[PDB]
Amino acid sequence: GQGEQDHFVLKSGHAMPAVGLGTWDTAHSVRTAITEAGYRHVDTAAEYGVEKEVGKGLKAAMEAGIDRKDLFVTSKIWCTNLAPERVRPALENTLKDLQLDYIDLYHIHWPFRLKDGAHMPPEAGEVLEFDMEGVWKEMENLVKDGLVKDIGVCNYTVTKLNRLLRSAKIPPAVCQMEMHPGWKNDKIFEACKKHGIHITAYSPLGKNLAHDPVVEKVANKLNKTPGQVLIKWALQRGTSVIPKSSKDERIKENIQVFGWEIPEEDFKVLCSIKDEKRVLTGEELFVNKTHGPYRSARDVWDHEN
């Protein structure tokens, strides 16, 4: 509650480290974040195109004494593979690049299907229909076959979430969303809360909150960096957090968020910042203001923002 929990227990019972290295020189970074920073949770995605490097970083850290069972690895299936018959092949390719025989968490990157070779923004005929139920069924099979410990989703809405639940035999263990003082997304958070779905916040620094005087003033008082405050904010909010950084020093700092906390007043401050700083609207690759099927950012978020 005081953002002092270093891990969260998923609905399946599996423990997931509160802080994870975001991967949005990846090998070195991963290896170092684990062996020197103390990281045990690495978040990645096939879409980024760096899994191969993450795998190399993971192999080195393990050959260095870190047990596989002590690591929490997450990946995401990209939009072009959001079709029942493309789920298995996508995950297996993920396991190959990461050089693992299983992953801990596997998310649906975005709840939209895209045609192979689609553009940003998407042209007409590129954002295909999404058989959410058929795809999730296949995701559940990954869990049953022991290749994935937990499945989850990113960038969802209450509407899509509810739809997902009206047929899920295995509830999503985690819901990963953009979260920070600029955009708290209380709504989807509240929906996750009631259903016992854990929440992971991404893009902790935001529209750079690390340079917002409000955050800076709190960081000066606490004598921490804006990034640490922002990350601790997420923790005290009760969500795991995956900060994106490419420097070992920032990476080391980002996990040095235990042993202290943000006074309720300051925490009140950061929370009372009006939600108007949403970085990932989804317009870049899903909006087509004319032919659709999503002719606006609001459609992308079911007009529930």
CATH superfamily: NADP-dependent oxidoreductase domain
Task: Tell me the count of domains.
Answer: 1
The DSSP helix count reads 12
Gross morphology: globular
CATH architecture: Alpha-Beta Barrel
Describe what this molecule looks like in 3D.
- By secondary structure, this protein is α/β, with parallel strands linked by helices.
- The chain has one domain: TIM Barrel (Alpha-Beta Barrel), CATH 3.20.20.
- It contains twelve helices and twelve strands.
- Strand 9, helix 5 and strand 10 form a beta-alpha-beta unit.
- Helix 1 runs parallel beside helix 2.
In short:
With 305 residues, the chain is α/β, with parallel strands linked by helices. It has helices spanning 26-35, 51-63, 84-98, 132-144, 158-165, 186-194, 213-222, 226-237, 248-254, 264-271, 283-286, 297-300, and strands at residues 7-9, 15-17, 21-22, 41-43, 72-77, 103-108, 113-114, 127-128, 148-154, 174-178, 198-202, 240-242.
